[PDB]
Design an enzyme around this catalytic site. Structure first.
Site, mmCIF file in Angstrom:
data_model
loop_
_atom_site.group_PDB
_atom_site.id
_atom_site.type_symbol
_atom_site.label_atom_id
_atom_site.label_comp_id
_atom_site.label_asym_id
_atom_site.label_seq_id
_atom_site.Cartn_x
_atom_site.Cartn_y
_atom_site.Cartn_z
ATOM 1 N N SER A 139 0.826 -1.211 0.000
ATOM 2 C CA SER A 139 0.000 0.000 0.000
ATOM 3 C C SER A 139 0.871 1.277 0.000
ATOM 4 O O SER A 139 1.547 1.544 -0.997
ATOM 5 C CB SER A 139 -1.030 -0.056 1.140
ATOM 6 N N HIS A 157 -6.935 -6.542 -1.734
ATOM 7 C CA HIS A 157 -6.170 -5.761 -0.737
ATOM 8 C C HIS A 157 -5.922 -6.522 0.587
ATOM 9 O O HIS A 157 -5.785 -5.913 1.652
ATOM 10 C CB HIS A 157 -6.845 -4.401 -0.470
ATOM 11 N N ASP A 175 -8.499 -5.590 -6.368
ATOM 12 C CA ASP A 175 -8.303 -4.662 -5.253
ATOM 13 C C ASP A 175 -9.282 -3.490 -5.393
ATOM 14 O O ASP A 175 -9.294 -2.809 -6.418
ATOM 15 C CB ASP A 175 -6.852 -4.172 -5.254
HETATM 16 O O1 LIG Z 1 -3.212 -6.968 -1.672
HETATM 17 C C1 LIG Z 1 -2.587 -7.909 -1.210
HETATM 18 C C2 LIG Z 1 -2.228 -9.266 -1.763
HETATM 19 C C3 LIG Z 1 -1.495 -9.521 -0.427
HETATM 20 N N1 LIG Z 1 -1.945 -8.174 -0.090
HETATM 21 C C4 LIG Z 1 -1.740 -7.417 1.087
HETATM 22 C C5 LIG Z 1 -1.939 -6.025 1.115
HETATM 23 C C6 LIG Z 1 -1.727 -5.303 2.294
HETATM 24 C C7 LIG Z 1 -1.316 -5.956 3.458
HETATM 25 C C8 LIG Z 1 -1.114 -7.338 3.442
HETATM 26 C C9 LIG Z 1 -0.671 -8.055 4.703
HETATM 27 N N2 LIG Z 1 0.759 -7.828 5.001
HETATM 28 C C10 LIG Z 1 1.615 -8.606 4.083
HETATM 29 C C11 LIG Z 1 3.082 -8.385 4.435
HETATM 30 N N3 LIG Z 1 3.336 -8.886 5.798
HETATM 31 C C12 LIG Z 1 4.767 -8.771 6.150
HETATM 32 C C13 LIG Z 1 5.645 -9.779 5.432
HETATM 33 C C14 LIG Z 1 6.986 -9.468 5.193
HETATM 34 C C15 LIG Z 1 7.822 -10.375 4.534
HETATM 35 C C16 LIG Z 1 7.321 -11.606 4.106
HETATM 36 BR BR1 LIG Z 1 8.436 -12.855 3.216
HETATM 37 C C17 LIG Z 1 5.980 -11.913 4.345
HETATM 38 C C18 LIG Z 1 5.146 -11.013 5.003
HETATM 39 C C19 LIG Z 1 2.518 -8.106 6.746
HETATM 40 C C20 LIG Z 1 1.033 -8.221 6.401
HETATM 41 C C21 LIG Z 1 -1.326 -8.063 2.262
#
Ligand SMILES: O=C1CCN1c1cccc(CN2CCN(Cc3ccc(Br)cc3)CC2)c1
Ligand SMILES: O=C1CCN1c1cccc(CN2CCN(Cc3ccc(Br)cc3)CC2)c1
Ligand SMILES: [Cl-]
Ligand SMILES: [Cl-]
Ligand SMILES: [Cl-]
Ligand SMILES: [Cl-]
Ligand SMILES: [Cl-]
Ligand SMILES: [Cl-]
Ligand code: NA
Ligand code: NA
EC number: 3.4.14.5
Lengths: 820, 821
Positions: free
Chosen positions: A678, A788, A756
């Site tokens: 984001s 999202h 999204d």
């Molecule tokens: O759109 C879409 C499709 C996926 N998505 C989305 C959008 C906004 C937030 C999140 C959730 N965060 C995803 C990243 N996370 C840290 C993280 C770091 C390294 C590694 Br390797 C894995 C995870 C925290 C939570 C997902």
């Protein structure tokens, strides 16, 4: 200093490594304390709450018994008693006098009684289905607080009511025709529109009057305040539907920055019920003068409700720039029946006195922005021409504090009989008193469940805040009459999320820290005999116990540095696992960096950010820095990037990265990567664009590439109107500066959910369009069934696999060094 | 044998290399001969034609003078005289012989000029005369009325209009569409070919002028227009993203996906009464006396339509849904009655039409493979009242397309309409009196992409294009249709020819090329000995377009062939690496299409369209192209190989051909083979990696068909049948349903797709990606946000070529690619 290279695993080996280390349930929330009132029994209270019992389970109602006394040598674990036996609950309504629960679970709306006159169950209750003739999904059910037989709900963007005893069902509003297309008919009643749910966190658009007005017949009048919205002038966009087999796109009303928001107004449904629960008539009523005339300059209805006695409806109103806030009391007498006959309509306007007028009990301004919150407590009305209330604000000092205010309800200078328009300040009430309950270089919290609880007997107010540290939320208590000492009730070393009982003799805390996972405990409150103002706490019982510190998770260290900007900035550092002396490792900077978020604090990061620890096990340095603009540091700190999004964030990130690099020789600045979602993905693009000397690779997740595509409520708050900030919008939009990206491949990776709704795929698709024109390389991964978030777990597994593999092949490994 | 590693150029360097090596115009076409009729003059004919003057100029009308005699010692180059003046891009044009009136669209405007008629021949550029209008929107598909050259017709907002170019009168004929109303409600059109007909049958018009005018008692006349009326209400609606990415929107259109409803179709006729001074009296819209479903049992598609030379009967070539049955049917104007919502008057008009007037199925044929529609159909002048004589082409008899002279008896039908019953399947079928095969052999006559026939009715000959001498070359032939036997080749061997014969049959023009030499256009005069008019010789007359010559930056490929284990000779093309080092093996790149209705391997110049295969050869890649079973110009049995079985047989031929070259040439490194293609080529590129990952290291799939249920009715059902009756054919042929079979190794799969593609929708890629994500498989992806099944913006084409070369370098050709495994 030799360069460390990460182990070059194959795609299949990384998948296996991720699967082995992967092996959370919603913790107890939405608490409510009901007294037993049984002198002979062993329990004082029953606590009801929503929780998920395990990982695969659905979210449902539970209860636990609070004992009158405890064995203080031992620790008491409260058992979770299921309240229901159904053959997924997000929230519930409750009526104290009857004990009636009301909640939605799937397509049905259900009700059951517990803890009222009919007593307390000792086993799970089978809920009663509410009858309906409506074909479509019913949303947002609410009990009438004045009568628990009546509920209200939304169906096809119109308000309905239903009686759970008599089975009478009645449509209250006829604003939306479900059969016709949405281009012609874009009106709705009782529902918060997109921007208000997404950017102001208001999810409901109608409010029951808490008290009934008794009629001479022997029946009564129930009232519902509601918002009527007209989205006809709002821009329409087409997002691809989840059913990919059906190659189509769904329409919805997205007010992009600069363009029109919905046309809003207040309405009131007046419902006459006879002596034994039958509807006599329903009168739909509208404001005596238009919303634009009565509330000059108001774009958004931020919050709304009723006073405790049901005398006035209240509302917190914002202007378009979100620099002016008004709290306005609205009498029911301001509403007249909806009449189309012009002769009959003019008589109804004359029948309302000129003394009946909107009452602006509070107004404030700021050069930065108004942050809407959920704190607003109105006291019982002692004097007819006064009203007393607690409100929170950053506008006086630049930090959010509680203020006890008393406003004089004047008869207005403006008289409607003259047939003119009211001047801006004609409805403004004088402020008799405005006492600051709290003060200092720290904030009171009023978002994401944080709120106040007022004890009117002891004349105290409980609140959450950042007084002891900006890295830990804590519960405090203070007097609102003679405000002075602020007593901390939660223990230092953890960050707490608290819920206080309505009886103000208990509180629950969901707490954690960097080392220890989440726990939920109950604490009993009590005063010394000599002073009711003083409050001590005592541990009573555990509701949710932690599993203990996880054996396969090394938490980060919180660091900080004094910035050249003048502020202390905080960060998290993940050192590599098995740190070799005389060697330098590749560094992945994880970032969000936008407003209304704080990544760096003393909370357990081993669930949501578990894979930052996984990166450290492979031999990456992981860094997270809360740059200027981030949350929980006051409005001046947060206001640093006003009109200037993209321009200051990466300076703080690089400054903090260089602070670590000089202080730790094991950070290899030649192989630094950046990653975020984001606003984090946005800044990851800006990082590579502005500072290609620092950042080798940038993985941008769901990036905002073009601020004109984003909505009104968010973008205009921080960047203003596009015409009044021509340069900020250009300089802050990465899609406009495609030529500034590198000509080297394997440095840019774009990730985006295809469906999204918040950050549309067009941000990515238009960025790619300009990248093609500029002859620039890129890599792209699409998640075709995501919105999202991570709905489907396979796409989350594929994301994690690809990111580790991408960082391996293009940053960390020996091949990555040879590839340049 | 050491492996050759290609030079590892950077992204900026490959951009420079491609920019330098990049440094075309339409060759003359749509020819037409008009006689001078001037004894004292030196010219016999004047030729009119469309051509692009240079590299950055619009397509426009030109003319050249054909002299009566030539200096046979010299070589005459005809000069291009501009017909039109510059305005205050012509795709096609109409002509009327008796008046000399041209009609053509140029941008938004419809224009006309006069030349070659009674009014004479211009010696300077004519000013185009705009046809004025009160219509708000773009006018489409203008056609001259052959009966009266004052009148034209055109489409405006999916309805038929007519305009008089002298009196300036304008009239709307059909009121079927409402421009103001939305497309979900109003899905009807008139005079317009729908998506599947344009894209899969190459019919672009939906209305046809009657070539003769019926005279009235008053001293005026009746003009007639046959037209198709479509109702797309039940057809599936799909949303493709609009070109304007600023407005986050998607445009709706009617796409009949396989196994779902095609448009509801019918014939209509507009009867147009004109008075003595060219003014319209009345317009009577008319419909078939019984429904289309009753009169034409089993018919889905109107493939072709038109009129007989006298305008007595309208004709149409009609297909069933499975496309295993063709029917040529004559439709009289008396079958149409005026449209009447009044119930009593409608019944009276039905009774007034005789029972003898009936549809006349003058020809019918079937096949176990499929009907390939073509543009060959010639009706002779009607000599007897109860007979019709015509030439037609078909693969149904022998399995190769050949010409057949057919005479059919116009029987008064056994079915009678007065009884009030429905007709049996064979009630409208005519008996065949005569069916003489004009040509025969293991080779086809060509009837598509401009190829047709020219029928000399005086000498009783028929000119045609065919593959008799070779399947690698197109040639012009001639033969008698009365006593068919000798087939005389008119074009010279060593080139593939594309020919246009004069209406007078005393000249022909040939656009020709070969693998070594770019395209030429030359005029040839035809003549016979006095003793035998059947015997036809030719003689070079003049050059229209001289070749630029074999340009120095292009080394063409060698055409090879190998006898397959399938029993067919399979042809191919081979680009050897430039500066071929001895004792070394180079990485290979197989370029592929491999689907029906296309032949990539032939004796034509490939240095324009496939210039970058030579560029791959210059970098050090072996480039191979093989026409597998199913491809064009080898007969119907060869083409039918993959019926119900798409995706299953094609890669066997590609690998077999690759291994033929690998044994014969030691410079082909089989450890480093790549595959690449667009559309069906991208489909097969996925299938190659999916099936034969042992052979193919990398696959670059462009606009790939990943799921046959997502592709249209006309194409998919022809080759695969209906989905319900071939469940496993569709499963085995759809890569998205078999996502688990892709490699777990990354840097092997690259998907390329135009985001706005209306033919092979991006959904094919996005649903493939959906299943690849579920299966845990890696992929690379490139989107071109402002492209739709082509390169219109040059920047997207440049980015494609850059990324493709860099991808092949980094994951196949280079030294770093070998270390990367
Ligand atoms: O759109 C879409 C499709 C996926 N998505 C989305 C959008 C906004 C937030 C999140 C959730 N965060 C995803 C990243 N996370 C840290 C993280 C770091 C390294 C590694 Br390797 C894995 C995870 C925290 C939570 C997902
Ligand atoms: O969709 C879309 C978007 C582009 N496109 C599309 C679809 C179908 C056909 C064509 C045209 N062919 C493009 C490929 N050409 C050979 C070629 C090989 C290597 C290299 Br390097 C460059 C060119 C032949 C002509 C383009
Ligand atoms: Cl204070
Ligand atoms: Cl008080
Ligand atoms: Cl020329
Ligand atoms: Cl023969
Ligand atoms: Cl003849
Ligand atoms: Cl079958
Ligand atoms: Na929200
Ligand atoms: Na076509």
């Amino acid at each position: 200093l030799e360069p460390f290279y990460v182990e070059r695993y194959s795609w299949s080996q990384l998948k296996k490594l991720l699967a082995d280390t992967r092996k959370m349930a919603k913790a107890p929330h939405d608490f409510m304390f009901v007294k037993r009132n049984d002198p002979d029994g062993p329990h004082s209270d029953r606590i009801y709450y929503l929780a998920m019992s395990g990982e695969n389970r659905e979210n449902t109602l539970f209860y636990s018994e609070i004992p009158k006394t405890i064995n203080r040598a031992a620790v008491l674990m409260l058992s979770w008693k299921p309240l229901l036996d159904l053959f997924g609950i997000a929230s519930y309504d409750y009526h104290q006098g009857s004990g009636t629960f009301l909640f939605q679970a799937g397509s049905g709306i259900y009700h059951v009684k517990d803890g009222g006159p009919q007593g307390f169950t000792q086993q799970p209750l089978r809920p009663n289905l509410v009858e309906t003739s409506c074909p479509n999904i019913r949303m947002d059910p609410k009990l009438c607080p004045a009568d628990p037989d009546w509920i209200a709900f939304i169906h096809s963007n119109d308000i309905w009511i239903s009686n759970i005893v008599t089975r009478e069902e009645r449509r209250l509003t006829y604003v939306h025709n479900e059969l016709a297309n949405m281009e012609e008919d874009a009106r709705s009643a009782g529902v918060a529109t997109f921007v208000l749910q997404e950017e102001f966190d208001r999810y409901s658009g109608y409010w029951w009057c808490p008290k009934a007005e008794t009629t001479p017949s022997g029946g009564k009048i129930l009232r519902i305040l509601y918002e009527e919205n007209d989205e006809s002038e709002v821009e329409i966009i087409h997002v691809t539907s989840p059913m990919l087999e059906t190659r189509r796109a769904d329409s919805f009303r997205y007010p992009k920055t600069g363009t029109a928001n919905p046309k809003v107004t207040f309405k009131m449904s007046e419902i006459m019920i006879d002596a034994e629960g039958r509807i006599i008539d329903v009168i739909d009523k509208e404001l005596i003068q238009p919303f634009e005339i009565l509330f000059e300059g108001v774009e958004y209805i931020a919050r709304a409700g009723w006073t405790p006695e049901g005398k006035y409806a209240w509302s917190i109103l914002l202007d378009r720039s979100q620099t002016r806030l008004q709290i306005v009391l609205i009498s029911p007498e301001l509403f007249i029946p909806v009449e189309d006959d012009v002769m009959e309509r003019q008589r109804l306007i004359e029948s309302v006195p000129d003394s009946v007028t909107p009452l602006i009990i509070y107004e404030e301004t700021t050069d930065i922005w108004i942050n809407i919150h959920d704190i607003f407590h109105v006291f019982p009305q002692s004097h007819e021409e006064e009203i007393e209330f607690i409100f929170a604000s950053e506008c006086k000092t630049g930090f959010r504090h509680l203020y006890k205010i008393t406003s004089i309800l004047k008869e207005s200078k403006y008289k409607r009989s003259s047939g003119g328009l009211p001047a801006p300040s004609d409805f403004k009430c004088p402020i008799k008193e405005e006492i600051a309950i709290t003060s200092g270089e720290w904030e009171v919290l009023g978002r994401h469940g944080s709120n106040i609880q007022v004890d009117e007997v002891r004349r105290l107010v409980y609140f959450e805040g950042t007084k002891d540290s900006p890295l830990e939320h804590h519960l405090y208590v203070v007097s609102y009459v003679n405000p002075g000492e602020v007593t901390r009730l939660t223990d230092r070393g953890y960050s707490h999320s608290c819920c206080i009982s309505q009886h103000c003799d208990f509180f629950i805390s969901k707490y954690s820290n960097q080392k220890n996972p989440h726990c939920v405990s109950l604490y009993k409150l009590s005063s010394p005999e000599d002073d009711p103002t003083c409050k001590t706490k005592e541990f009573w019982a555990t509701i949710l116990d932690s599993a203990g510190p996880l054996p396969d998770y090394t938490p980060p260290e919180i660091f900080s540095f004094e910035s050249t900007t003048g502020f202390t900035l905080y960060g998290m550092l993940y050192k590599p696992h098995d740190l070799q002396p005389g060697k330098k490792y590749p560094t992945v900077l994880f970032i969000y960096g936008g407003p209304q978020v704080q990544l760096v604090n003393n909370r357990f990061k081993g669930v949501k950010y578990f894979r930052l620890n996984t990166l450290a096990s492979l031999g990456y340095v992981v860094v997270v820095i809360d740059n200027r603009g981030s949350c929980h540091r006051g409005l001046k700190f947060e206001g640093a990037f006003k009109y200037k999004m993209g321009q200051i964030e990466i300076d703080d990130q690089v400054e903090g990265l260089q602070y670590l690099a000089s202080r730790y020789d094991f950070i290899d600045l030649d192989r630094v990567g950046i990653h975020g979602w984001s606003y984090g993905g946005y800044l990851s693009l800006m990082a590579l664009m502005q500072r290609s000397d620092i950042f080798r690779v940038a993985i941008a997740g769901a990036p905002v590439t073009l601020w004109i595509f984003y909505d009104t409520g968010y973008t205009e708050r921080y960047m203003g109107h596009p015409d009044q900030n021509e340069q900020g919008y250009y300089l802050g939009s990465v899609a406009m500066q495609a030529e500034k990206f590198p000509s080297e491949p394997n440095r840019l990776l774009l990730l985006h959910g295809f469906l999204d709704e918040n950050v549309h795929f067009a941000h990515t698709s238009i960025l790619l369009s300009f990248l093609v024109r500029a002859g620039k390389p890129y890599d792209l991964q699409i998640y075709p069934q995501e919105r999202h978030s991570i709905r489907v777990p396979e796409s989350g597994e594929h994301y994690e696999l690809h990111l580790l593999h991408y960082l391996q092949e293009n940053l960390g490994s020996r091949i990555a060094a040879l590839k340049v």
